[PDB]
Amino acid sequence: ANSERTFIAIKPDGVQRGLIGEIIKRFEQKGFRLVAMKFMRASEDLLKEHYIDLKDRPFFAGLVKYMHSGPVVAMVWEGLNVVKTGRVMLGETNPADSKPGTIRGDFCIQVGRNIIHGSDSVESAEKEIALWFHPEELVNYKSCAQNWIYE
Amino acid sequence: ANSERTFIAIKPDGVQRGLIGEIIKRFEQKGFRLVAMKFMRASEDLLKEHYIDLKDRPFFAGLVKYMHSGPVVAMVWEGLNVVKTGRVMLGETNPADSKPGTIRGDFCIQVGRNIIHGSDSVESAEKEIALWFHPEELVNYKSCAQNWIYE
Amino acid sequence: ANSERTFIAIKPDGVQRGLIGEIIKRFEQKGFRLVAMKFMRASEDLLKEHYIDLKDRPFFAGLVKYMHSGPVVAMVWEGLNVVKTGRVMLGETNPADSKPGTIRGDFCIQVGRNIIHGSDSVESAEKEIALWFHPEELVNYKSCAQNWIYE
Amino acid sequence: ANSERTFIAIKPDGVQRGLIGEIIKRFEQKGFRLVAMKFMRASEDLLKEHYIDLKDRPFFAGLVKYMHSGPVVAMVWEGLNVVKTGRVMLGETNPADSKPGTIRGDFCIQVGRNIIHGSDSVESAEKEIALWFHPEELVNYKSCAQNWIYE
Amino acid sequence: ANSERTFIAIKPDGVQRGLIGEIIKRFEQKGFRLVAMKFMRASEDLLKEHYIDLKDRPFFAGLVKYMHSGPVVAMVWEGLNVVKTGRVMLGETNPADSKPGTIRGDFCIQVGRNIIHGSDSVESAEKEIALWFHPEELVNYKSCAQNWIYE
Amino acid sequence: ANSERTFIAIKPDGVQRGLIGEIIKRFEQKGFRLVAMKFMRASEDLLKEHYIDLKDRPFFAGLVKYMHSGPVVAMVWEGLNVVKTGRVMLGETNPADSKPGTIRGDFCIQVGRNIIHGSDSVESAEKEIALWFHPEELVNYKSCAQNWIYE
Ligand SMILES: Nc1nc2c(ncn2[C@@H]2O[C@H](COP(=O)(O)OP(=O)(O)O)[C@@H](O)[C@H]2O)c(=O)[nH]1
Ligand SMILES: Nc1nc2c(ncn2[C@@H]2O[C@H](COP(=O)(O)OP(=O)(O)O)[C@@H](O)[C@H]2O)c(=O)[nH]1
Ligand SMILES: Nc1nc2c(ncn2[C@@H]2O[C@H](COP(=O)(O)OP(=O)(O)O)[C@@H](O)[C@H]2O)c(=O)[nH]1
Ligand SMILES: Nc1nc2c(ncn2[C@@H]2O[C@H](COP(=O)(O)OP(=O)(O)O)[C@@H](O)[C@H]2O)c(=O)[nH]1
Ligand SMILES: Nc1nc2c(ncn2[C@@H]2O[C@H](COP(=O)(O)OP(=O)(O)O)[C@@H](O)[C@H]2O)c(=O)[nH]1
Ligand SMILES: Nc1nc2c(ncn2[C@@H]2O[C@H](COP(=O)(O)OP(=O)(O)O)[C@@H](O)[C@H]2O)c(=O)[nH]1
């Protein structure tokens, strides 16, 4: 449970606006373990499979267009309930309901524009991960504060 | 509604406790547009002009007085929904009902000493706008990353 | 009640994990006054004395042994509502239930490691307060801004 | 001397790249007073005037145009040695030479865009203040902490 | 010489204009360990017995006075060379010639209100230590990150 | 020269001590471009090859192993003068000679644990880039603020 993982990617806006050091910031202070991460451009292919379940809903292609227009940071975070906790850490997908203190609350205003992405479920989490990252990609180490964070 | 504007002014107590950089930075990083700004001391008739609705109310002149005791930072901000979002940002007029994360929540204790104020309505917005500034103090320009905030 | 005081100790985990400054600051910038502060390793007897009402819980022994593992930072903070406002500042006891922007909410994850302690109640405040420090360790001073803070 | 002042302007670039709040807080937390401050599109004549010691510089006119490009933030700050100290604040003129800690060190890279301008002599100082600001635009007040800053 | 401890005291001005947090934080983040710490109003003799080496000098009793005008934060920190570095950390005694990025650089203006003090030597540092704390107030623990600090 | 590039890697020690968002963040506000990054553990022979030179120097062996003991953040950054400006932002190889305001200065103390590495030549830059990156791993975009960062 304490090993639960999630997939975090900072969208193209986040990277254009200078948010990566910030965003990351928030996860490492939270006490979470950066399992993996890589900066890159997403292929249309990728995205669509990513967003496969969305395939239909109007924004879709724009969405794909957009994810495609710039680089992103893809990463994987490990921890107790990272999935649900980080979700929270990020705010409501529509920045307008995100409160302050949260990724989107603090940093942004429009949904299309929401600078970041998080796995809504541990499933989404697994698929997502595996889809983004080969397995040997995903590092395994122990944080010194482990036993400070973890009971 | 992406042009929306509200009247944000930091109170002499924000001013005095050294909360201006912080506060504008809030707006800055959420991506709203600073339209106008001017550090000034306020006229009693202007306040008065402004605090108009609370005209009597037991705190009324205690207020006015206070609001007049120091210089303030008057500003105009713009963005999709800034009025409402701003509010949010600010917190709950009553700093005890303001959650951490938000300005008041973050840095102040009582409602008398509330560090800032914000248009609570659009119509409201403008009036204060019109009221506090001369339609020529309002700079029309675009953000460099507007395309990153807006689709 | 602007001289309500409260007791806040920064557990061994908040120590080991460097949040001694982050934590204090929050206090400082809100508008509280630090009253007494001390860095020590609480004895067990102290410990038990402390956490007396949970004398019964399954985790009790547990509590106490970690709380004695390392140094803590005890402190008295006074201000208007200190007590109850210091807790919203803290967030949920269970770092998972605790929003962003709060201390827990932002820097920790398990309730067995939830880095800070806050009095829940004025009398507990009282109680702890006394249980932790002799009467004359509590410094008395006024704040220069105190009247920027308080009306 | 501790009532010496200097003229602080934030370049359109500082305005573009959101460093308003940040640069402001720099002063605030250093211990300087905000005498005055407003957001404006400077004019070309003001400009030329404002930058006459440079009337015969390859850049000039480019220097103009650029500064005329967007709005800026004009500010006057007072304090003991504001003028000079303010300048170490800034860093060098050429961001390349600017140490980290400084405003130019920290946020910028090129001379042709170095977000900020500091007065370099008290004369220059008042000269510019003169030039920019309407005496009635200069704030008379006292920090609740003046005591705490000054001996 | 990694268990070299130095005495760092934040002055009435530190305490007054909220930099106790900020201050403790810088030391945190550089990886020194907080051995002892206590919020206490000094005692004229102690002040005396301390600033004994500048018994005569202009200031002196000006110094003593001030340093007792409020409480102070007493601290002991450990780390390889903490002293020298602490100093460095601190700034040049004189707010005047202290670079940005140092304690003083960033938050203070005159040598009269120099928000904190730190040992300037070992020999010194001990004398102060002895002098401001009883032995048992000296917290020995092992930081987790320590071997991440030290090879 | 606006396209120069450097190799920045954050060492395991910096990763163990949550200083990644901070480290990146330093690069991002200055306004330098993130060109490639990935999280990962380095291969012995990746490392021996990277420190190839000081193949002899006593430290070599310990260096290796250390570097190998946990994951790193490997990056590439582009901007006018990134290589030189990038070192200056890092500071002195020896944290002890590092100034406050700099990454090491601020964040670490012993050479052996210096948390990060920056390209010392532009050759080295390009060389180090090789070793470490597959050319296709070099993303290419244009920051929306470049024109504000550069003339
Ligand atoms: N432009 C635009 N994008 C949207 C809209 N609704 C959702 N999206 C995008 O689709 C992403 C994923 O949709 P959803 O899963 O429902 O949110 P997520 O689970 O947080 O990924 C959101 O984060 C948005 O960036 C919309 O109405 N307009
Ligand atoms: N002393 C005092 N001032 C108050 C009280 N309620 C409101 N105010 C002040 O009057 C301001 C305006 O209140 P309100 O109309 O609720 O907010 P606005 O419409 O956003 O300015 C508040 O932000 C406070 O500064 C009160 O109970 N006591
Ligand atoms: N391991 C563990 N510790 C707990 C649990 N519930 C509470 N505690 C711990 O003991 C302290 C006292 O608990 P409680 O009275 O609920 O929390 P409070 O409202 O923060 O003081 C908490 O701050 C926790 O560190 C639990 O279910 N398990
Ligand atoms: N393009 C360009 N602008 C320069 C150069 N030198 C100075 N300036 C610009 O004109 C301003 C005024 O120059 P000067 O008075 O030396 O510098 P200041 O008084 O230190 O900051 C600088 O802040 C730059 O923006 C140069 O070589 N090229
Ligand atoms: N008012 C005043 N205080 C001074 C002066 N020089 C030094 N002091 C004070 O005395 C303290 C100690 O003297 P010194 O050893 O020279 O300071 P250090 O370098 O902290 O140890 C300083 O921190 C100052 O607050 C001076 O010219 N005027
Ligand atoms: N233990 C130890 N490590 C050192 C020493 N000198 C350098 N190193 C380590 O090896 C690295 C590379 O040294 P060097 O090539 O001179 O520095 P670079 O090329 O400027 O950054 C540094 O990051 C240090 O951690 C030393 O004297 N002792």
DSSP string covering chain B, please?
A: --S-EEEEEE-HHHHHHT-HHHHHHHHHHTT-EEEEEEEEE--HHHHHHHGGGGSSSTTHHHHHHHHHSSEEEEEEEESTTHHHHHHHHH--SSTTSSPBTBHHHHH---SSS--EEE--SHHHHHHHHHHH--TTS------TTHHHH--
Helix (H, G, I), strand (E, B) or coil at C73: strand
Cβ A29–C107 below 8 Å, yes or no?
Answer: yes
Q: What is the CATH number of domain D1-151?
A: 3.30.70.141
Find the helix packing angle between B20-29 and D20-28, rounded to 10°.
Answer: 170
Q: What are phi and psi of E40, to 5 degrees?
A: -145, 145
Amino acid identity of residue B105, one-letter, is: G
Domain ranges of chain C: 1-151
Instruction: Classify residue E102 by its DSSP letter.
Output: B
Give the Cα separation of B51 and B68 in Å (integer). 12
CB pairs under 8 A between D and E: 60
Q: Which residue has the tokens 């190889």?
A: F93
Q: Could you tell me which chain B residue has the CA closest to the CA of C82?
A: B109
Chain centre distance of CA B55: 20
- Asked whether F124 lines ligand 6 (CB < 6 A), one says no
Q: Is F87 annotated as a binding residue?
A: yes
B141–F contact, CB cutoff 8 A: no
- Asked whether E101 lines ligand 5 (CB < 6 A), one says no
- The coordinates were experimentally obtained by X-ray
- Quick one: tokens of F77? 């950054």
Which residues touch A57 (CB under 8 Å, ≥6 apart)? none
Q: Is D104 annotated as a binding residue?
A: yes
Give the Cα separation of D84 and D121 in Å (integer). 7
Amino acid identity of residue B34, one-letter, is: L
- Asked whether D59 lines ligand 4 (CB < 6 A), one says yes
Q: How far is CA A14 from CA A9, A85, C100, D22, in A?
A: 9, 20, 19, 19
- Quick one: tokens of C46? 């102290």
DSSP string covering chain D, please?
A: -TT-EEEEEE-HHHHHTT-HHHHHHHHHTTT-EEEEEEEEE--HHHHHHHTGGGTT-SSTTHHHHHHHHSEEEEEEEESTTHHHHHHHHH--SSTTTPPBTBHHHHH---GGG-SEEE-SSHHHHHHHHHHH--GGG------TTHHHH--
Give the Cα separation of D108 and D96 in Å (integer). 8
Please give, rounded to a whole number of angstroms, the shortest distance from the CA of C25 to a CA of chain B.
11
The E72-78 sheet, strands edge to edge: C116-118, C5-10, C72-78, C33-40, E33-40, E72-78, E5-10, E116-118
Q: Could you tell me which chain A residue has the CA closest to the CA of B26?
A: A106
Cβ E16–D145 below 8 Å, yes or no?
Answer: yes
DSSP string covering A24-61, please?
A: HHHHHHTT-EEEEEEEEEPPHHHHHHHTGGGTTSTTHH
Which one of the ligands is nearest to C117 CA?
A: 3
Q: Could you tell me which chain C residue has the CA closest to the CA of D145?
A: C144
Please give, rounded to a whole number of angstroms, the shortest distance from the CA of A83 to a CA of chain C.
12
E112–D contact, CB cutoff 8 A: yes
Burial class (CB in 10 A: 0-12, 13-18, 19+), B134: exposed
Please give, rounded to a whole number of angstroms, the shortest distance from the CA of F137 to a CA of chain B.
23
Which residues touch F102 (CB under 8 Å, ≥6 apart)? D100, E101, F88, F89, F90, F91, F92
Question: Catalytic residue numbers of E?
Answer: 117
